[PDB]
Design an enzyme around this catalytic site. Structure first.
Site, PDB file in Angstrom:
ATOM      1  N   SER A   1      79.489  -2.440 -24.371  1.00 25.54           N
ATOM      2  CA  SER A   1      78.770  -2.630 -23.121  1.00 25.54           C
ATOM      3  C   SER A   1      77.956  -3.934 -23.054  1.00 25.54           C
ATOM      4  CB  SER A   1      77.835  -1.485 -22.745  1.00 25.54           C
ATOM      5  OG  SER A   1      78.606  -0.412 -22.205  1.00 25.54           O
TER       6      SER A   1
ATOM      7  N   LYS B   1      70.610  -6.281 -23.310  1.00 22.45           N
ATOM      8  CA  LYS B   1      71.707  -5.382 -22.942  1.00 22.45           C
ATOM      9  C   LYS B   1      72.301  -4.804 -24.243  1.00 22.45           C
ATOM     10  CE  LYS B   1      74.593  -2.974 -20.574  1.00 22.45           C
ATOM     11  NZ  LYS B   1      74.310  -1.914 -21.567  1.00 22.45           N
ATOM     12  N   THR B   2      72.317  -3.464 -24.294  1.00 20.32           N
ATOM     13  CA  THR B   2      72.896  -2.732 -25.438  1.00 20.32           C
ATOM     14  C   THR B   2      74.387  -2.525 -25.292  1.00 20.32           C
ATOM     15  OG1 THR B   2      72.332  -0.710 -24.284  1.00 20.32           O
ATOM     16  CG2 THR B   2      70.762  -1.466 -25.881  1.00 20.32           C
ATOM     17  N   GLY B   3      75.057  -2.162 -26.397  1.00 16.46           N
ATOM     18  CA  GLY B   3      76.390  -1.597 -26.327  1.00 16.46           C
ATOM     19  C   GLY B   3      76.558  -0.582 -27.458  1.00 16.46           C
TER      20      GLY B   3
END
Length: 266
Positions: free
Chosen positions: A47, A211-213
């Protein structure tokens, strides 16, 4: 730089505690001080690609501003897992700006697919990356398949080094126009999914846009920028992935890696 060499040794030690790979870059944007581990290796970005996606949407909007207010009347059939905003508003639709905020702040997967479709397909996100100088990023699939994170698969990957340069240019430099840069920053400053990752490894007085993933094979990532008071921004890129298909994704390795670099850079 002696602080950088010490930090790199500590990142090697951190990696030795699990059966996987750590990909890391921290960049002090004023001095160019650069802490890296496996900087030129490919990692599944999961992500974290939603940042590149939304930058591409913002770029298109500079060439039609009302694009952000366009209502997308999507269907129940568009809905896929991990879509906490779009599922709530199906039947009413959402604006393009609302879809961007949902995909960035809640990691909404349906929102990402709607935006990919708006742009013309995953190839348009790759083309946008090329236009801002990123020759490495490649978006091959849509959600949720881009999260498979299979060993040795180069689909839906980038390198920590390439992503550090892109985050630098997008949030701090001039890849986007000033209004678009400010909107991307504002959205990422308001992320809801990152409290245990980069945010947990920096001093209390630093602001974070991230922003994480998270994906298969225990993949846990976080990318973004920290804004310390009275100093230039610091870019943080953290990719981790595991060899066991049954691995549980973790937050603490990302927080630990972040702390190593935060100590080095002050």
């Amino acid at each position: 730089m002696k602080n950088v060499a010490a930090a790199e040794r500590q990142l090697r030690e951190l990696e030795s505690t699990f059966d996987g790979r750590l990909g890391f870059v921290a960049l002090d944007t004023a001095t160019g001080a650069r802490i890296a581990h496996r900087g030129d290796e490919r990692f599944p970005f999961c992500s974290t690609s939603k940042m590149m996606l939304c930058a591409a949407v913002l770029a298109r909007s500079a060439g039609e501003p009302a694009l952000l207010q366009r209502r997308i009347a999507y269907a129940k059939g568009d809905l896929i897992r991990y879509s906490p905003i779009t599922e709530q508003h199906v039947g009413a639709g959402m604006s393009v700006a609302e879809l961007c905020a949902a995909t960035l702040q809640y990691s909404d997967n349906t929102a990402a697919n709607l935006l990919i479709a708006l742009l013309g397909g995953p190839q348009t996100v790759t083309a946008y990356a090329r236009s801002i100088g990123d020759a490495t990023f490649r978006l091959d699939r849509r959600e949720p398949e881009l999260n498979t994170a299979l060993p040795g698969d180069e689909r839906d990957t980038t390198t920590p080094a390439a992503m550090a340069a892109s985050v630098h240019r997008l949030l701090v430099g001039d890849a986007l126009g000033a209004a678009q840069r400010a909107q991307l920053n504002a959205w990422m400053l308001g992320n809801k999914t990152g409290d245990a990752r980069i945010r947990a490894g920096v001093p209390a007085d630093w602001r974070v846009a991230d922003k994480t993933g998270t994906g298969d094979y225990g993949t846990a990532n976080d990318i973004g920028v920290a804004y310390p008071p009275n100093r230039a921004p610091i870019v943080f890129i953290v990719y981790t992935t595991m060899r066991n298909p049954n691995a549980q994704a973790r937050d603490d390795v990302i927080a630990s890696a972040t702390r190593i670099a935060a100590r080095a850079f002050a």
